[PDB]
Amino acid sequence: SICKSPLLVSTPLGLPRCLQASNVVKRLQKLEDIASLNDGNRAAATPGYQASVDYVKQTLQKAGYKVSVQPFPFTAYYPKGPGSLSATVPQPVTYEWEKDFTYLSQTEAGDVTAKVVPVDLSLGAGNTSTSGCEAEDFANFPAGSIALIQRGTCNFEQKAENAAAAGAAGVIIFNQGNTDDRKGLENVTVGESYEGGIPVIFATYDNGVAWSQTPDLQLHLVVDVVRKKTETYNVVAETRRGNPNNVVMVGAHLDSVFEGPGINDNGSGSAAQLEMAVLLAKALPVNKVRFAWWGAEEAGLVGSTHYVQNLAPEEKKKIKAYLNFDMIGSPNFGNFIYDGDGSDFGLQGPPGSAAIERLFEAYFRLRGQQSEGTEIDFRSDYAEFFNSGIAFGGLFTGAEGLKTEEQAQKYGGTAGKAYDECYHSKCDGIANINQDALEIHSDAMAFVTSWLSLSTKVVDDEIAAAGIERWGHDFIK
Ligand code: NA
Ligand code: NA
Ligand code: NA
Ligand SMILES: [Zn+2]
Ligand SMILES: [Zn+2]
Ligand SMILES: [Zn+2]
Ligand SMILES: [Zn+2]
Known part of the structure; x- marks a missing residue:
């Protein structure tokens, strides 16, 4: 009801109010059901992934979006x-x-x-x-x-x-x-x-x-392995409204590893972004918002890399910012914001990445929550956007790293345990979600997406002023 009004979903403090972690969890349960009906996973080149695609597509169509299911060639790999x-x-x-x-x-x-x-x-x-x-x-x-x-x-x-x-x-x-x-x-x-x-x-x-x-x-x-040449899919949609030459793009990979359902990694980002897209169907953005659910991220960012590399140069120039949401419900979470300004780890994103990080930082501060940087060394689907000079940022609640004592003081949870003890595991199912973290990170996703959908000036200002060991999970060198 109230959240169908453009006066709520068009603005940065209204959209988060309308995006509830409890509603995101309903979508996570659907992804869990899909995994359970498809051998326990949602991996690239499996029926569990296809059923995930179908769910995302149908949801978007029901909310009024035209949906592009984009295939790409893909060599699947499985250790036997x-x-x-x-x-x-x-x-x-x-x-x-x-x-x-x-x-x-x-x-x-x-x-x-x-x-x-x-x-x-x-x-x-x-x-x-x-x-x-x-x-x-x-x-x-x-x-x-x-x-x-x-x-x-x-x-x-x-x-x-x-x-x-x-x-x-x-x-x-x-x-x-x-x-x-x-x-x-x-x-x-x-x-x-x-x-x-x-x-x-x-x-x-x-x-x-x-x-x-x-x-x-x-x-x-x-x-003892098998490789098979096949295909997989990205799912892309965008608001009808908004400047097509100044696109704010959000992405979240939709595949899991073969080992499990991938509910936190990355049902959490996929489902939160889907709830946001449904809400944004009624918004009046200044800048067009584009949403992508990436395939084959767990095989080396294959879908996101393919999407960016295959855009015509004219189309690539229309993407002003990319926001990535990969793991935002970790049970033993920290509040991690991509370190686009290099303040923590010395690697800077393209011009505008600092402004995006600052928006996330300011929102967490406004909510009375602490936050800290996380590395941006090509670990998720922003990698090819980074490589292409597109400003980017994102949020992360932590994976296999062990929480520090200082982090336990800031975020609660247990020092000395992984942020997500089910990372890439059979137990990364519906119970492997902290709804308080999911709520705050989804709130921040909504705030920053909505902010940029109204003005990219903080990014534009940095663009004007300005004048690889891993690729995903594995090291490439
Ligand atoms: Na290939
Ligand atoms: Na790996
Ligand atoms: Na040599
Ligand atoms: Zn992931
Ligand atoms: Zn993963
Ligand atoms: Zn920083
Ligand atoms: Zn909230």
């Missing part, structure tokens, strides 16, 4: 079982899955036994290895061997594809070892676009050093 790695020559040694070695995400499967050949290594503290980054590194590389490659400088995908082009049967990339914190296993990917055709694993630095100095070494490596 643990990997194996053993030395056969000069002496039999069994290496330990998830201790000595792990998979590169998006690797091909394989079962390979071959001589191990090091490629352009530069060992030791402080090294600036470029191992495997240039085709010349593989001059005189014997086809059929396993390439032993050191992390450094360029993307894992480039190292592995260069090895494949030299006829390698498999690739072992070991951590760089230039600092003490770069010697263990890490979450690493060859990218959804990997086309090397051969298996690729990651190993600890010390294992790489020792293997590189073992004469006659042969390793037997088994990678």
